[PDB]
């Protein structure tokens, strides 16, 4: 493993931590501005419901019921092939107002003007 890539791995872990915290804060508490976290041409898929483009993603989010996400696990990887991070998050989600559900979410974030934005958002939830 390159020394460079040990650096990139750690860079990726930090940015993963901060992006995830800001992201889930913004989904639960500040949806009106959620579009800031997405590139104009990002693709979202929540439970198989697709949205193409930041504006449709914003619209989608405003139409979802209120939510509270509790993060448990976080994993992240540098993708070298501009730089992009693969991020895997998991926890429990409370959709207002239903029973508690568990969720897994895969991001690919990339940097624009020194700010990290979603390229791809995959969200899958299950019962119990």
């Amino acid at each position: 493993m390159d020394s460079d890539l040990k650096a990139k791995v750690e860079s990726c872990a930090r940015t993963a931590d901060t992006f995830t915290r800001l992201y889930y804060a913004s989904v639960d508490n500040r949806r009106q501005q959620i579009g800031r976290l997405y590139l104009d041409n990002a693709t979202l898929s929540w439970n198989g419901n697709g949205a193409i483009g930041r504006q449709m993603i914003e619209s989608y989010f405003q139409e979802l019921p209120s939510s509270n996400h509790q993060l448990n696990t976080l994993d992240a990887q540098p993708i070298v092939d501009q730089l992009a991070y693969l991020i895997m998050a998991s926890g429990s989600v409370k959709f207002a107002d239903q029973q508690l559900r568990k969720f897994q979410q895969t991001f690919i974030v990339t940097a624009e003007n020194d700010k990290w934005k979603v390229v791809s958002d995959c969200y899958r939830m299950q019962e119990v």
Binding site: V9, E10, A16, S45, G50, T73, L86, M88, S120, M125
Partner: protein, 173 residues
């Protein structure tokens, strides 16, 4: 649950990729459930990256066949190296997968979301259930690249937990 969140078994950002992902999943998982997982050595980039995460025993709880592998960046009053339990190179990746117990994945359980589909790269997420030949719920994301007239896994991130019990019963029959 709204109609914007009601579960659909699969989503494709580009329908053209469906057969590709179908071919990929069939071959990959047949090999994976064959026990002879070494053949997946050709499925992985020579510089591929792979990691496995799972919730704690207070949260999950018990996944002792898999806790050897857990790379979870989220820490609370506990710092380990960020390079810990991340596998670099096809050798480490397929070896890690070979260290798993024998598995029986139920493709009837699968969800498949292709969220990036272009000539350079493919990103798809697969969630489902598999039997530990105990039932585990998995969610894996593949970042796959073209390589010598074929597909090739450059990045794989894996999440594992215990299934709900009613799933276990529905699977039991």
């Amino acid at each position: 649950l709204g109609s914007l969140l009601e579960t659909k078994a699969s989503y494709l950002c580009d329908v053209a990729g469906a057969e590709v992902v179908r071919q990929f999943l069939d071959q990959y998982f047949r090999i994976f459930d064959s026990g002879n997982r070494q053949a997946l050595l050709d499925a992985y980039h020579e510089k591929a990256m792979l990691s496995i995460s799972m919730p704690s025993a207070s949260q999950a709880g018990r996944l002792n066949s898999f806790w050897k592998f857990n790379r979870n960046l989220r820490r609370l009053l506990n710092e380990e190296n960020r390079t810990r339990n991340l596998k670099y190179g096809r050798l480490a990746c397929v070896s890690t997968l070979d260290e798993w117990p024998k598995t029986q994945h139920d493709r009837r359980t699968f969800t498949v979301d292709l969220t990036i589909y272009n000539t350079s790269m493919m990103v798809f997420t697969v969630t489902g259930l598999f039997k530990e030949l105990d039932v585990r719920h998995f969610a894996r994301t593949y970042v796959v690249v073209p390589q010598n007239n074929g597909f090739c896994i450059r990045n794989e991130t894996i999440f594992i937990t215990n299934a709900t019990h009613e799933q276990v019963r529905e699977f039991k029959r």
